[PDB]
Design a binder for this molecule. Structure first.
Ligand SMILES: [Zn+2]
Ligand SMILES: [Zn+2]
Lengths: 132, 192, 176, 195, 114, 134, 8, 196, 48
């Protein structure tokens, strides 16, 4: 099944297959896809949770009385590119409209955030804010 | 890059040389000196070779095959088997033995190819080393008939005695470390 | 004899829980560790937090701030950094002192690389004749410390200033 | 995944390694971190290359390099490594055969593409570091075929030598018959043409 | 030549001379252990550094696809015809283009220079 | 006799123990029940000048594991236990090391891929949203 | 592009 | 944008620099976070001449990140906790049989023979650190933090990873020694394998 | 120049600063002219 002296056809058939599957600008598109799909979520998850507490508020017995607020970001979501008009009504933004009207081609970025309140009342409440 | 092999020397030419001359740089990139021979030395290649040897810097490191630092408590013991014969000959009528003998030994082997290429002599090297370090170094040199050229060096016998009643406990570098420093200085700056 | 063709097969037992946890104690071969001279030994958690973590906040903590000044002092120290960490012994290295102070001292450090895809078990002979396997809770590599005179830090700094020690170093060690 | 597989395939970890044993064994670096040593390097190298060509655990972009003189195996999963696809040569025969080009020729209504060629093991992506360990043939038929012996151990083959040129230099006709500065100048002039 | 580490402290032993017995002793500075030296050589420096590269060559290099191979030079040890041949591949090798042959075939591992 | 004293009786008796590296599937199979007191049988067959070690998986557990030995002369290993009563003890000295390897070659890679997918489940990725959140 | 003595 | 490869050891020779051979490694924490921190291991040239300097000849130094002054390498190994000279050389020299590499390591061992305490070495690193140090305790803890995080992050950043860092540091030294002996060729900056 | 069997008259160095320290300012005038002429005429070009 060897291909002797038919190689000029075969090499260009395989080259054509390469260029059909992978375009000339595949590197930029693939790198940006990696960014959005993985790196943004990983950057959100790598960030340490926010820990906050009051500075001995009320000057009472203060046995850990100041509440502790803990925030953890999770599950980043991206919408399709959208343009909001002067009326405030969202609408999809086509690239040519961005070119003509000098708009920026951007997409909204949403994160789920979980907020836990620890007031040393023997109860902790973990409210969740979806798609902030 | 596009000079010729006729020059047979590194030569700076073109814009860099123009910059060197224009700025009168203290250090040229390729300092060179053209020596014209006076008389018969120009006519005969061998005499020109003699002048070359006179004009080219030569150190002990260039002519030294290898250096080894040994500890030999007794010179007569001759820890190295090879040096037995000439050490025995030298110590049949020993010189400077009355002061003392330093136990640490520096043994230097000189490549015959380099020695004959520069036309150096073992006695000449011994004299130069003796003059450079005065009496602090005692040198033993083989005859040229010996297949391996060996130079044996020991610390000063007077220094080994210290010639001092107090003797000072400073004990700077003891003798081995001092011998290593001597070896490095000899190799770098002998200027034979 | 039977030794040239002996076949031994034993039951394997893995108890769900053991009162004593199982660890690994590894000594370097070059150390030449010998247990014949190990008449007594002392293994305990380190106190190096004395030098770098705790009781280092002894004097400034008990200086005597009070009232509004006490509230401000506590809050200011806490917000200045991120609350200094105190003793949490279970997450600290181990110190071994064989035969008291006279004998050699070793330091064991938990193997940092976790075995997320590996487990280690130990087989021990028992009268019932069945092997027993116990999981390795932790791995420790112990390295000895010589029972020799140790240079003082201040003296060490003074000596290092004279980095060019032309004089013999051995005499310097003898002087100390 | 590569680290897990390496642990499976008899790679002693640095922590468990006796310091004396390192001298006689190859060091395995993954993404520049010295993971461990392996007593038998060649078997591991062949297994890694088989896995990559089957695309099982090692992705295609991952590059394995073995420096035989320095006793080091380096595996890079890092981003930003530049790679070019090359045909694979086993024995002295190209792995690409007429059946593959027949399936590619009817690329429509056969759903056979470059990804199928990569998965089949006919082609492979090789970065420069791995290029240092690869014997390449410019043209398959000429170099692979037996002649006066120059190399009998070709491991890869170039798909076509004209693919070394870029986008602007590819429009030059008969580039090999021009002086090199002229090709460089045309590459710049072609960007300024009108169309 | 070789460096010896003391058993008691696992540190380097430095040469020392006992004046009383005129005996060379390798003694650590940190600990008092002293050992008589059999070699009696403290420091050896080879300025020519004419060290054979046959020892440094690894037998594993025979597996390299990129190395040239000759069947003209047979192996001395086993008679295998193939033998990869390569140059010094070494910095500070001065000026040598000698070919350091390595016999192919498994486990022979024979390195010879002609 | 003190709290920090190490019971070196195991060292005095020179009790010999074997250390083995075993895979996660085997350990997890053992941990599934972990209380039945039985997980398998270790069979060692010795010949004139060669010894082989193998482990058989229990039939209930499954619903061959050859062992490869490793030299222990390069490093000395001992096993010590920290009792819940704060009485440290030494069990014995390691005299042999072994590794457990899977029998299946290719189909085992399928189980490895399943394990990789299970380990990749906690990994979270950016999610595409069709409609902008209001 | 010619030789070592010429031009590149 | 082209950049030099991270998490790799490259040995170069710089004529102008006092170091005859310098080996550098730029380390990043798996690209997850933090700027890339470069640690250089350099060998001082034998050109410098003195009664002790000529005797020691080439002496290895290390330019740890966030420490202003060059630190002798044996001191760094002792700071990591490997006090014994034999163990340090075990990490640096993989085969003790070769005499030339041990000869190369000997001068740096002599330079650091004053410090034989891990705590003292940490205090020395802190004291020569660029950031000011008020007390010995603070200096020791600060230098320990620098070694844990700032230096060779890719090998490890936490989880008692001193042995891995020691082995990689010893690999850097081993490669520098091999370059100095001439057994390995100095790396080339232009190679596109290095240019991510 | 001091070494025996070396011609003191014709021996010349390419470094102009050495010529200045050894032979003087007029000798440097001539030597600098010679060196510049060499750099100019190596290609064959001629400057008056
Ligand atoms: Zn000692
Ligand atoms: Zn052979």
């Amino acid at each position: 099944e060897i291909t002797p002296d038919l190689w000029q056809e075969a090499c260009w058939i395989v080259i054509s297959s390469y260029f059909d599957e992978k375009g000339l600008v595949r590197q930029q598109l693939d790198s940006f896809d990696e960014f959005i799909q993985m790196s943004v979520q990983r950057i959100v998850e790598d960030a340490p949770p926010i820990d906050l507490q009051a500075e001995a508020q009320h000057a009472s017995g203060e046995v850990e009385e100041p509440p502790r607020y803990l925030l953890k970001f999770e599950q980043i979501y991206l919408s399709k590119p959208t343009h909001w008009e002067r009326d405030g009504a969202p609408s999809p933004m086509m690239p040519n409209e961005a070119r003509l009207r000098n708009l920026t081609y951007s997409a909204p970025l949403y994160v789920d955030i979980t907020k836990t309140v620890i007031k040393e009342g023997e109860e902790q409440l973990q409210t969740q804010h979806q798609k902030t | 890059f596009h000079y010729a092999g006729v020059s047979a020397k590194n030569v700076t030419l073109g814009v860099p040389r123009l910059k060197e001359l224009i700025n009168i740089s203290k250090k040229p990139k390729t300092p060179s000196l053209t020596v014209f021979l006076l008389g018969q030395s120009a006519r005969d290649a061998e005499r020109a070779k003699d002048i070359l040897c006179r004009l080219e810097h030569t150190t002990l490191r260039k002519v030294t095959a290898n250096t080894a630092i040994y500890y030999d408590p007794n010179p007569q013991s001759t820890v190295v088997a090879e040096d037995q014969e000439w050490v025995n000959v030298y110590y049949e009528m020993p010189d400077f033995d009355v002061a003392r003998i330093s136990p640490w030994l520096l043994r230097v082997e000189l490549d015959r190819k380099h020695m004959t290429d520069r036309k150096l002599t073992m006695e000449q090297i011994a004299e130069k080393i003796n003059a450079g370090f005065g009496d602090d170094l005692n040198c033993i040199f083989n005859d040229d008939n010996a297949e391996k050229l060996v130079l044996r060096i020991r610390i000063m016998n007077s220094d080994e005695n210290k010639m001092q009643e107090e003797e000072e406990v400073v004990d700077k570098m003891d003798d081995d470390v001092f011998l290593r420093c001597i070896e490095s200085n000899m190799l770098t700056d002998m200027t034979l | 004899g039977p030794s040239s063709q002996n076949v031994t097969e034993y039951v394997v037992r893995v108890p769900k829980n053991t009162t004593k946890k199982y660890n690994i104690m590894a000594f370097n071969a070059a150390d030449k560790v010998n247990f014949a001279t190990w008449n007594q030994a002392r293994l305990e958690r380190d106190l190096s937090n004395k030098k770098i973590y705790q009781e280092e906040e002894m004097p400034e903590s008990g200086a005597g701030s009070e009232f509004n000044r006490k509230l401000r002092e506590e809050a200011r120290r806490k917000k200045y950094g991120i609350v200094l960490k105190e003793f949490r012994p279970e997450d600290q290295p181990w110190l071994l002192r064989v035969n008291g102070k006279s004998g050699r001292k070793f330091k064991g450090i938990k193997k940092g690389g976790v075995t997320e895809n590996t487990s280690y078990y130990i087989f021990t002979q028992c009268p019932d004749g069945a092997f027993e396997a116990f999981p390795v809770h932790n791995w420790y590599n112990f390295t000895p410390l010589a029972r020799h005179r140790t240079l003082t830090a201040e003296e060490a700094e003074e000596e290092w200033e004279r980095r060019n020690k032309v004089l013999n170093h051995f005499s310097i060690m003898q002087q100390r | 995944p590569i680290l897990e597989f390496l642990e499976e395939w008899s790679m002693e970890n640095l922590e468990e390694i006796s310091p004396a044993a390192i001298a006689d064994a190859t060091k395995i670096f993954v993404n520049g971190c010295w993971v461990g040593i392996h007593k038998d390097p060649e078997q591991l190298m062949n297994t890694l290359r088989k896995l990559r060509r089957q695309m099982d655990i090692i992705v295609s972009e991952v590059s394995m390099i073995r420096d035989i003189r320095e006793r080091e195996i380096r595996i890079y999963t890092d981003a930003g490594r530049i790679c070019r696809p090359l045909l694979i040569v086993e024995k002295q025969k190209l792995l690409l055969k007429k059946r593959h080009i027949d399936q590619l020729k009817e690329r429509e209504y056969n759903n056979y593409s470059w990804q199928d060629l990569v998965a089949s093991g006919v082609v492979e992506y090789i970065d420069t570091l791995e290029e240092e360990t690869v014997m390449l043939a410019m043209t398959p038929d000429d170099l692979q075929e037996k002649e006066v012996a120059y190399c009998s151990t070709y491991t890869h083959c170039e798909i076509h030598p004209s693919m070394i040129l870029g986008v602007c230099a590819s429009i030059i006709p008969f580039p090999d018959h021009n002086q090199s500065p002229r090709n460089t100048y045309q590459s710049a002039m072609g960007k300024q043409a009108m169309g | 030549v070789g460096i010896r580490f003391c058993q008691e402290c696992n540190n380097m032993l430095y040469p020392k001379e006992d004046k009383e017995n005129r005996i060379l002793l390798y003694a650590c500075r940190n600990c008092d252990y002293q050992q008589e030296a059999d070699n009696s050589c403290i420091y050896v420096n080879k300025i020519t550094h004419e060290v054979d590269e046959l020892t440094q060559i690894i037998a594993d290099v025979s597996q390299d696809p990129t190395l040239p191979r000759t069947e003209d030079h047979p192996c001395q040890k086993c008679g295998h015809k193939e033998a990869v041949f390569f140059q010094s591949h070494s910095a500070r090798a001065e000026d040598a283009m000698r070919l350091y042959y390595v016999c192919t075939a498994p486990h022979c591992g024979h390195r010879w220079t002609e | 006799a003190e709290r920090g004293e190490l019971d070196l009786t195991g060292a005095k008796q020179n009790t010999g123990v074997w250390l083995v590296k075993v895979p996660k599937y085997l350990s997890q199979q053992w941990a599934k029940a972990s209380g039945r007191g039985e997980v398998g049988k270790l069979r060692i067959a010795k010949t004139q000048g060669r010894t082989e070690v193998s482990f058989t998986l229990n039939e209930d557990l499954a619903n061959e594991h050859p062992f490869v030995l490793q030299s222990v002369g390069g490093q000395t290993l001992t096993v010590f236990t920290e009792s819940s009563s704060d009485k440290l003890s030494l069990e014995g000295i390691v005299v042999q090391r072994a590794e457990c390897r899977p029998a299946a070659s290719e189909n085992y890679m399928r189980l490895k891929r399943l394990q990789i997918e299970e380990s990749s489940k906690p990994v979270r990725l950016s999610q595409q949203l069709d409609k902008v959140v209001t | 592009i010619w030789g070592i003595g010429c031009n590149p | 944008q082209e950049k030099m490869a991270t998490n790799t050891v490259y040995v170069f020779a710089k004529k102008d620099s006092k170091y005859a051979y310098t080996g550098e490694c730029r380390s990043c924490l798996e690209n997850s976070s933090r700027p890339t921190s470069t640690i250089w291991v350099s060998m001082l040239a034998r050109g410098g001449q003195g009664a002790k300097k000529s005797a020691i000849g080439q002496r290895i130094v290390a330019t740890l990140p966030y420490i202003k002054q060059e630190v002798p390498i044996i001191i760094v190994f002792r700071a990591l906790g490997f006090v014994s000279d034999r163990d340090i050389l075990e990490h640096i020299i993989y085969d003790f049989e070769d005499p030339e590499m041990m000869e190369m390591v000997k001068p740096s061992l002599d330079e650091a023979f004053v410090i034989q305490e891990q705590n003292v070495a940490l205090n020395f690193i802190g004291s020569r650190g660029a950031k000011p140090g008020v007390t010995k305790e603070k200096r020791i803890k600060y230098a320990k933090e620098v070694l844990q995080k700032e230096m060779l992050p890719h090998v490890g950043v936490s989880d008692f990873c001193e042995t891995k860092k020691a082995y990689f540091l010893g690999y850097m030294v081993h490669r520098l020694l091999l370059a100095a002996l001439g057994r390995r060729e100095l790396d080339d900056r232009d190679h596109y394998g290095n240019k991510r | 120049l001091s070494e025996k069997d070396v011609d003191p008259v014709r021996t010349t160095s390419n470094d102009i600063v050495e010529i200045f320290t050894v032979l003087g300012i007029e000798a440097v005038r001539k030597a600098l002219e010679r060196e510049l002429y060499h750099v100019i005429s190596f290609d064959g070009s001629y400057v008056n």
